[PDB]
Automatic annotation (TrEMBL), chains A, B:
<feature type="domain" description="Peptidase A2">
    <location>
        <begin position="20"/>
        <end position="89"/>
    </location>
</feature>
<keyword id="KW-0378">Hydrolase</keyword>
<dbReference type="GO" id="GO:0004190">
    <property type="term" value="F:aspartic-type endopeptidase activity"/>
</dbReference>
<keyword id="KW-0645">Protease</keyword>
<keyword id="KW-0064">Aspartyl protease</keyword>
<dbReference type="Pfam" id="PF00077">
    <property type="entry name" value="RVP"/>
</dbReference>
<protein>
    <submittedName>
        <fullName>Protease</fullName>
    </submittedName>
</protein>
<dbReference type="InterPro" id="IPR034170">
    <property type="entry name" value="Retropepsin-like_cat_dom"/>
</dbReference>
<dbReference type="InterPro" id="IPR001995">
    <property type="entry name" value="Peptidase_A2_cat"/>
</dbReference>
<dbReference type="GO" id="GO:0055036">
    <property type="term" value="C:virion membrane"/>
</dbReference>
<dbReference type="InterPro" id="IPR018061">
    <property type="entry name" value="Retropepsins"/>
</dbReference>
<keyword id="KW-1039">Host endosome</keyword>
<dbReference type="InterPro" id="IPR021109">
    <property type="entry name" value="Peptidase_aspartic_dom_sf"/>
</dbReference>
<dbReference type="GO" id="GO:0006508">
    <property type="term" value="P:proteolysis"/>
</dbReference>
<dbReference type="GO" id="GO:0072494">
    <property type="term" value="C:host multivesicular body"/>
</dbReference>
<dbReference type="InterPro" id="IPR001969">
    <property type="entry name" value="Aspartic_peptidase_AS"/>
</dbReference>
Length: 99, 99
């Protein structure tokens, strides 16, 4: 689909049975989800944004279906006010930026 | 152009006679440039993200070219590492997310 940017680019994602809403963010290198439980072992990582750094748990090779399209990648889970679908999974569903 | 997302989407912007590099960011409501000086008066603006909120100087009706496409609008200035072009100026140059 072609998404305009007048409102925040939110889409529905299916992740671990849960359907959550999320933001298609071209400014984000990583994908960051709000506090939830994912199976598997995790690493800790520190990632920084607009305020400063937060601590997240890094889960690798996790499956998200972003807007009807499946994608596999690294998902960081922790204290974000919104779920961010970053560039590592956007490439996978074939997302581009056009003008 | 048709910009894909394997690398960070940086572009040359030109503001105040000088060329700078900025990230194209669909998850950023507003444009925020690095600490520079701009004409006229500013107002206070609190922006939040990952890691909380920060305070930036709001300037209005500032001309900025992104890829030789001119935009006149609101640019916030504050303590950021990378200049960010947010939705407010990406809708002006007619930018969409496609997939
Ligand atoms: C992997 C992740 C997500 C940690 N990356 C980022 O946060 C990067 C950081 N860089 C590197 C970065 C470090 C840094 C340090 C100080 C200050 C800025 C900084 O940018 C700058 C660009 N951001 C990406 C942003 O697009 C993220 C976005 C997330 C969001 C969206 C909506 C609500 C809350 C959080 C974001 O922070 N956008 C905010 C946003 C951004 C610009 C203008 C207004 C606003 C409001 C809101 O849209």
């Amino acid at each position: 689909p072609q998404i305009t940017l007048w409102q925040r680019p939110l889409v529905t994602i299916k992740i671990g049975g849960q359907l959550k809403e999320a933001l298609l963010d071209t400014g984000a290198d990583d994908t960051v989800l709000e506090e939830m439980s994912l199976p598997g072992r995790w690493k800790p990582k520190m990632i920084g944004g607009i305020g400063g750094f937060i601590k997240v748990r890094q889960y690798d090779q996790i499956l998200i279906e972003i807007c009807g399209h499946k994608a596999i990648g690294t998902v960081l889970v922790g204290p974000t006010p919104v779920n961010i679908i970053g560039r590592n999974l956007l490439t996978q569903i074939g997302c581009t930026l056009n003008f």
